[PDB]
Amino acid sequence: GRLIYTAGGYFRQSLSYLEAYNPSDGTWLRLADLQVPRSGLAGCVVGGLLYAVGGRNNSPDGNTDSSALDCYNPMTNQWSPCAPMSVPRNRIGVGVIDGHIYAVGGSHGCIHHNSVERYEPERDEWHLVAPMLTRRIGVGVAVLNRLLYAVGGFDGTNRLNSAECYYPERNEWRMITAMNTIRSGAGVCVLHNCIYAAGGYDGQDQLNSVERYDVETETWTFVAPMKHRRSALGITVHQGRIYVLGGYDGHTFLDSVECYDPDTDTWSEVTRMTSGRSGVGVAVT
Template sequence: MICPRKKRPIKDEDFSAIVVPSMRGHGYLDYTVESHPYKAMQIMDEFRHHELLCDLVLHVTYKDKIVDFKVHKLVLAACSPYFKAMFTSNFKECHASEVTLRDVCPQVISRLIDFAYTSRITVGEKCVLHVLLTAMRYQMEEVAKACCDFLTKNLEPSNVIGILRFAEEIGCTELHLRAREYINTHFNEVTKEEEFFSLSHCQLLELISQDSLKVLCESEVYKACIDWVRWDAESRAQYFHALLNAVHIYALPPTFLKRQLQSCPILSKANSCKDFLSKIFQDMALRKPLPPPPHRGTQLIYIAGGYKQHSLDCLEAFDPRKNVWIKLADMESPCSGLGACVLFGLLYTVGGRNLSLQNNTESGSLSCYNPMTNQWTQLAPLNTPRNRVGVGVIDGSIYAVGGSHASTHHNSVERYDPETNRWTFLAPMSVARLGAGVVACGGSLYVVGGFDGDNRWNTAERYQPDTNTWQHVAPMNTVRSGLGVVCMDNYIYAVGGYNGQTQLKTMERYNVTRDVWEPMASMNHCRSAHGVVVYQCKIYVLGGFNQGGFLSSVECYCPDSNVWTYVTDMPVGRSGMGVAVTMEPCPVILLEEDEDEEEM
């Protein structure tokens, strides 16, 4: 009898005896099938549909319905921490073959199960909120994020408050944040929708207390409160005073506040609110020192036009917090020697000229840039063109001072009324001034320095709007034209300029109360025809010109330390630009324009 031979185990040494090794003798096979996970899940999904190897039945109850789903525990646990904990911990469902999910829409569960097996989900607009709620309940983060992204893209003024409330109720932090950001950016549009009037007084109070609201003027916030109270005046009038305390009242234009006191029906029935606003208006009318109102949203420094070999048409904004420059919509035509100011959140550019090898045309134009839309609008032109004009704002009106047209240097002054879109001549200055420093302070307009075609001035004049008269104030210590002037803490700062022989780096400060000028710290660079603004209690100087050419440097002055510090450089050095500070442009508008450029 022949005994069968027993097979011995095969070892690695057996192969090494019959396989000829490479010269290195230590190679390994490393092979990956990229489609394997997808194919494996595809087969698992086929098993589910054919009820093969399913180890769990989900009983989904909703109202009077019960719908069953046969699934694999492993698949659910792999894509949901909720189910992973259920099936791997000491819960009673750990070894159960049946689990009941209560008060959940079966159609939504069906879609989430499909996603678990296929990594794909398709949801109609009407069902997204239900899917988001269920995905959050069962901790399916990818689906929840996809729903948030979809809802964010479809936010509108008419639905954003409802979505905000929903996100708050279900604890979806990301969606709540995005809805809040949308409301802050589109506040004025949102307040026109019916959802806005369904807010409780606490919700409205929380909303208007946000300094991140993007509004061109505080009057938009005030009007929103008035409209909300008027919607149900009988029950809501009691909350009006609390709402007023959240409005930045000192940021309201005096003319607007006066009209409200005269004609607002809500105020006429709320004596305490009317007395509160009347006192503030009286302080404004008497030019009493007022607390600086906090700004809504982020403020940026805007730089319009300028000159470098030719007049420029660019508009840029500088964010000192992030040290970044933002390219914005170009002006309709190149312009240098222009004035710039901000009125009710809008950026205005006044006068200037278009200078190039082919062209030299003085401008009388008035252009308005809206940061909410990133668009320019042309308004009523000046009565006379003005190059190197000075500009200031008092009580909701724009003042254009001096400048030149051809060989004529102006001592004339014009005032623009935005409500009528008209310019009106006012009393002229004592002398003609081109390249003068102009600033509003304490309800008066101050004009310092400048050039009349023959003489450069150190003299200063003050204009009183109430009497339409000018009076001389103390002259500067230094002759200056092409200087920059700003008002801060009831002081007027005169920075740089040209004395007829050289550009200056010196700065002096005018004490409005004592009527005296005193020298302050000098800049790091001499410059004239530069831009000067106040930003967060510091003075910023941008660009300009000196013997070395066009300057791109930006310097910052801190009044507490009396020290100038280099900040950064502008993208393009230039002189003769208009500068002002207002709210940052709407990020949605900028994003859309970037996408348009990419498509081109």
């Protein structure tokens, strides 16, 4: 069936790996390398194609933030460049609505973006939309009921517990209920119509706690914590379960992949990546 793809990441330098995990049989497959190494990117899927968005190439030869959008077709095992964003976005967050990719926040050098732009695959074109109310890098992004949510992050000075949401039909952002915890570099995704925020950095320590937002009650509630605290993790959903991949915990680069089963409210470590890394892009198709 569908596979969990992880692209890029960092360990000693930004990485070029593309690897796919099959949860059904527990196997990993190494696929075509990214054309340029990337960490701090985000992954998403539209129409069966995997996109790698933003990030940076941090190596001993220097750092270059990325405005790149690249597309991987599992059917060809090839990467194809697409149109670049208006600005480089390291530690970007992305979400998909109506088959368009929204690129949210991130940084370019010391600039922490509030800007947001939208990609239309059929036209290979990016368009700026209304900026967020807050500058946010290491921002978690998810889509619920065709609204875009931007959760936590770092504004250039402070790590954030705030969250906001974007209504495309009005092209407007509004603040929602703040999280219980400050989280920069959390994994944020939607599962069964709730927005989950897992891990992150609270300004002092990495987190293993996980909370979920219900738009109906406007409340964030804690669920079972992950076994391993982590920030700059990748998060995705496969067959109704959340998977978190890698990250950093202040001491090590995680290879751990943990799986959250909402039906039992438990996490387990289901596999490990081929090597420890943070700042991966991850998506499922």
